[PDB]
């Protein structure tokens, strides 16, 4: 059953893998992920080695967390685990943890270049961020950070979507750019409209230079809020700030996206809705004729709703590190 491990250091990091691990490299910056080539099953493969991952009770929840997290998501436009082990025996030597993913090599960025994608190709990678956003959503988990830095590409333009990534604010929502602590899950939503406009179009959306610039692109585009969002806003300050702006027409977004299909223009004008509740969700864009070429009603799953409370309780460092272990014990490859 033990693998046997051996040991060797890269980026004056100690790694200790199991020998099916072949050929490890290092590939950036909790901690170091090296791509390998998986012997016993012939694929490439990204590895991470968690930093520090029992240091404290924070590094021990997140461990924990992350672990979870990875565990429970098994989705093809969604990162999940081929692998997850440690060198040790027991509890006892218990104070690292190795996780393995297939190798993705770039990020979206990585893949686009600042470049005008076809629409055939923007339909085929839009679809799949919302087919793993769907999945993601039914469990009760709001991303909160797309962006195209925490999307896996590869070669052939599969994409999953991903935990953390390896400008930083040009895709989030205005409400979280502006700290309300009521979110819904089209927080996500309004970040894949700023994905597709610029796979469109070439061009960056709402490229601010800080904060309020961001804030002011926005509105340029989208209008001022209007009467309805105005009695959503619980802050009194926020809203006499609000009504003090002169108000502005939404732009028409035929203009702004010049002969791209209307099909695309018609569902961006349904995700970047200024007021959350009015935007399209990931199943109801998921069914836009948009993507008639790719939809799949019966092919489109659905995840079990996420426990995020066993995640968020506040547990000594070695009850967070026992429970760790068990997840690496319990840990079951996916058929493969
Ligand atoms: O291809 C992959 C796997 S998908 C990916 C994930 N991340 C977030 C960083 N996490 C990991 O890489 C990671 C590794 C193991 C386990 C896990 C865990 F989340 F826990 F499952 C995550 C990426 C960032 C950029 C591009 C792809 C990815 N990685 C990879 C491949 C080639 C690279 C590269 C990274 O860096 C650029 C040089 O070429
Ligand atoms: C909902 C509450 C919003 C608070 C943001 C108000 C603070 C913005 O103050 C802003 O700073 C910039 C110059 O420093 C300018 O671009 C803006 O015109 C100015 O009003
Ligand atoms: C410049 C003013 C920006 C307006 C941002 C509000 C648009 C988001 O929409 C609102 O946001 C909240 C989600 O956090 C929800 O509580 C509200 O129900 C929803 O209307």
Same mark, same amino acid.
């Given at each position: 059953?033990?693998?046997?491990?051996?040991?060797?250091?890269?980026?004056?990091?100690?790694?200790?893998?199991?020998?099916?691990?072949?050929?490890?490299?290092?590939?950036?910056?909790?901690?170091?992920?090296?791509?390998?080539?998986?012997?016993? *099953?012939?694929?490439?493969?990204?590895?991470?080695?968690?930093?520090?991952?029992?240091?404290?009770?924070?590094?021990?929840?997140?461990?924990?967390?992350?672990?979870?997290? =990875? !565990?429970?998501?098994?989705?093809?436009?969604?990162?999940?685990?081929?692998? %997850?082990? *440690?060198?040790?025996?027991?509890?006892?030597?218990?104070?690292?943890?190795?996780? %393995?993913?297939?190798? @993705?090599?770039?990020?979206?960025?990585?893949?686009?270049?600042?470049?005008?994608?076809?629409?055939?190709?923007?339909?085929?990678?839009?679809?799949?961020?919302?087919?793993?956003?769907?999945?993601?959503?039914?469990?009760?988990?709001?991303?909160?950070?797309?962006?195209?830095?925490?999307?896996?590409?590869?070669?052939?333009?599969?994409?999953?979507?991903?935990?953390?990534?390896?400008?930083?604010?040009?895709?989030?929502?205005?409400?979280? @750019?502006?700290?309300?602590?009521?979110?819904? +899950?089209?927080?996500?939503?309004?970040? %894949?409209?700023?994905? @597709?406009?610029?796979?469109?179009?070439?061009?960056?959306?709402?490229?601010?230079?800080?904060?309020?610039? +961001?804030?002011? =692109?926005?509105?340029?585009? %989208?209008? *001022?809020?209007?009467?309805?969002?105005?009695?959503?806003?619980?802050?009194?300050?926020?809203?006499?700030?609000? +009504?003090?702006?002169?108000? @502005?027409?939404?732009?028409?977004?035929?203009?702004?996206?010049?002969?791209?299909?209307? =099909?695309?223009?018609?569902?961006?004008? !349904?995700?970047?809705?200024?007021?959350?509740?009015?935007?399209?969700?990931?199943?109801?864009?998921?069914?836009?004729?948009?993507?008639?070429?790719?939809?799949?009603?019966?092919?489109?799953?659905?995840?079990?709703?996420?426990?995020?409370?066993?995640?968020?309780?506040?547990? =000594?460092?070695?009850?967070?590190?026992?429970?760790?272990?068990?997840?690496?014990?319990?840990?079951?490859?996916?058929?493969?």
């Amino acid at each position: 059953e033990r693998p046997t491990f051996y040991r060797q250091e890269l980026n004056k990091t100690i790694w200790e893998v199991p020998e099916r691990y072949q050929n490890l490299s290092p590939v950036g910056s909790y901690g170091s992920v090296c791509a390998a080539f998986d012997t016993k *099953t012939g694929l490439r493969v990204a590895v991470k080695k968690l930093s520090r991952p029992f240091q404290s009770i924070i590094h021990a929840k997140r461990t924990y967390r992350e672990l979870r997290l =990875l !565990k429970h998501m098994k989705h093809e436009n969604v990162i999940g685990l081929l692998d %997850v082990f *440690t060198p040790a025996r027991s509890l006892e030597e218990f104070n690292d943890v190795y996780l %393995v993913t297939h190798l @993705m090599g770039a990020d979206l960025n990585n893949i686009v270049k600042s470049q005008k994608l076809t629409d055939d190709h923007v339909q085929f990678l839009i679809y799949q961020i919302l087919r793993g956003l769907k999945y993601i959503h039914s469990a009760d988990i709001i991303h909160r950070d797309l962006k195209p830095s925490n999307l896996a590409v590869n070669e052939d333009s599969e994409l999953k979507i991903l935990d953390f990534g390896l400008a930083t604010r040009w895709y989030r929502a205005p409400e979280i @750019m502006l700290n309300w602590m009521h979110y819904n +899950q089209t927080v996500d939503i309004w970040s %894949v409209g700023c994905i @597709m406009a610029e796979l469109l179009t070439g061009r960056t959306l709402f490229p601010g230079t800080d904060h309020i610039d +961001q804030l002011k =692109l926005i509105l340029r585009l %989208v209008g *001022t809020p209007g009467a309805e969002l105005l009695k959503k806003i619980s802050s009194e300050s926020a809203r006499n700030y609000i +009504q003090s702006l002169t108000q @502005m027409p939404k732009m028409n977004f035929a203009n702004v996206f010049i002969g791209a299909n209307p =099909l695309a223009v018609d569902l961006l004008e !349904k995700m970047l809705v200024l007021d959350s509740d009015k935007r399209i969700t990931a199943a109801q864009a998921l069914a836009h004729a948009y993507f008639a070429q790719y939809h799949d009603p019966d092919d489109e799953p659905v995840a079990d709703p996420y426990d995020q409370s066993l995640e968020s309780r506040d547990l =000594l460092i070695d009850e967070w590190k026992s429970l760790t272990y068990d997840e690496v014990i319990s840990f079951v490859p996916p058929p493969l």
